[PDB]
Amino acid sequence: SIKVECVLRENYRCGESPVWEEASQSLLFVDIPSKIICRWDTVSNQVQRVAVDAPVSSVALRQLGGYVATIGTKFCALNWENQSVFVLAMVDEDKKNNRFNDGKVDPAGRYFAGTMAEETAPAVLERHQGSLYSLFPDHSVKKYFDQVDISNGLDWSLDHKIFYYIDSLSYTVDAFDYDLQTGQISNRRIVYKMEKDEQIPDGMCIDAEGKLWVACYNGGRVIRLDPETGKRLQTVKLPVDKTTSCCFGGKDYSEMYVTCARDGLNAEGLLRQPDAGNIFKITGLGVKGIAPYSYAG
Ligand SMILES: OC[C@H]1OC[C@H](O)[C@@H](O)[C@@H]1O
Ligand SMILES: OC[C@H]1OC[C@H](O)[C@@H](O)[C@@H]1O
Ligand SMILES: OC[C@H]1OC[C@H](O)[C@@H](O)[C@@H]1O
Numbered sequence: 001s002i003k004v005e006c007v008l009r010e011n012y013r014c015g016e017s018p019v020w021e022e023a024s025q026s027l028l029f030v031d032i033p034s035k036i037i038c039r040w041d042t043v044s045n046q047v048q049r050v051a052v053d054a055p056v057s058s059v060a061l062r063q064l065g066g067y068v069a070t071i072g073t074k075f076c077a078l079n080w081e082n083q084s085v086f087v088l089a090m091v092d093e094d095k096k097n098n099r100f101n102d103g104k105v106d107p108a109g110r111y112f113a114g115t116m117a118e119e120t121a122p123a124v125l126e127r128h129q130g131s132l133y134s135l136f137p138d139h140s141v142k143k144y145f146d147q148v149d150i151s152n153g154l155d156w157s158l159d160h161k162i163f164y165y166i167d168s169l170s171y172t173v174d175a176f177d178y179d180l181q182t183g184q185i186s187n188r189r190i191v192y193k194m195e196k197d198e199q200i201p202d203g204m205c206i207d208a209e210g211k212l213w214v215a216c217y218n219g220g221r222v223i224r225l226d227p228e229t230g231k232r233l234q235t236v237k238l239p240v241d242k243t244t245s246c247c248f249g250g251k252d253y254s255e256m257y258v259t260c261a262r263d264g265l266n267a268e269g270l271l272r273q274p275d276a277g278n279i280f281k282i283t284g285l286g287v288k289g290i291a292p293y294s295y296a297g
């Protein structure tokens with residue numbers, strides 16, 4: 001029943017931030033070092049790209065039209081019709097060598113995204129240089145906490161009272177109390193401790209049953225976690241090791257899309273993993289996900 005299929009063979013260097021746009025039946029994502037925001041029309045099977053001038057680490061839908069994205073250390077807005085990209089807000093202005101990493105829109109339309117020191121190789125970087133931010137609908141930015149190694153996967157409970165969060169080099173999935181009307185968070189705690197063979201926790205999405213799916217970078221898998229118990233429910237393996245993120249999409253959010261990377265693989269690794277950097281689809285998981293929220297500014 002569970003089927004893993006490589007569905008887009010474009011060999012991205014580090015595919016990240018998959019988000020399903022049901023209005024266009026398209027998958028949006030980024031290829032970070034390639035400095036492109038990608039939109040894959042799954043019907044026509046055509047990919048369109050917007051080139052940007054710095055590494056781009058996440059993309060989200062913008063409610064009023066178009067898209068938003070994290071490029072370098074700037075929150076940016078994109079009009080797809082004119083390919084125009086402009087800055088909404090900047091962060092980490094006191095940092096020499098930082099960039100945004102993962103980001104996602106909360107259930108009130110705020111664009112959460114966190115930063116990291118820039119890497120020279122995978123997970124080789126200055127420690128604790130990142131912070132978590134959110135871009136509010138009025139374009140102001142809230143700073144939540146600092147000392148982040150690599151800001152990564154994040155999502156919100158279905159009752160909108162819990163915020164789930166991954167700093168990759170903590171090797172844990174954490175939770176906070178979260179207030180929907182204000183976007184405030186409180187009382188960080190560990191919810192899941194990654195096993196050795198699960199490697200580095202990367203991207204994460206919630207499903208319609210309130211369980212969490214986490215992409216395991218270097219672990220060649222996604223895992224399903226119960227945040228209520230702190231236990232793993234399921235593991236699904238993929239034929240690429242550097243699985244970076246996941247989201248639900250397609251008909252009624254019943255299909256999972258998984259991004260991955262070829263950056264960091266040596267000659268032998270590339271040969272063992274011919275689909276490194278491609279987009280995968282997983283069907284038959286037996287759960288559906290939920291629609292992404294759109295940025296409200
Ligand atoms: O550290 C290697 C990779 O780990 C996963 C991060 O999301 C990505 O930005 C980073 O480049
Ligand atoms: O001051 C009370 C208010 O504090 C903020 C909460 O989001 C709101 O629901 C509550 O009513
Ligand atoms: O959302 C389900 C659970 O997720 C983990 C949180 O630490 C816990 O407080 C919450 O009840």
Ligand SMILES: OC[C@H]1OC[C@H](O)[C@@H](O)[C@@H]1O
Binds near residue numbers: 063107292293294295
């Ligand atoms: O309520 C503000 C915003 O919250 C996110 C929703 O996806 C968007 O439609 C809404 O406009």
Ligand SMILES: [Ca+2]
Binds near residue numbers: 101203
């Ligand atoms: Ca990531």
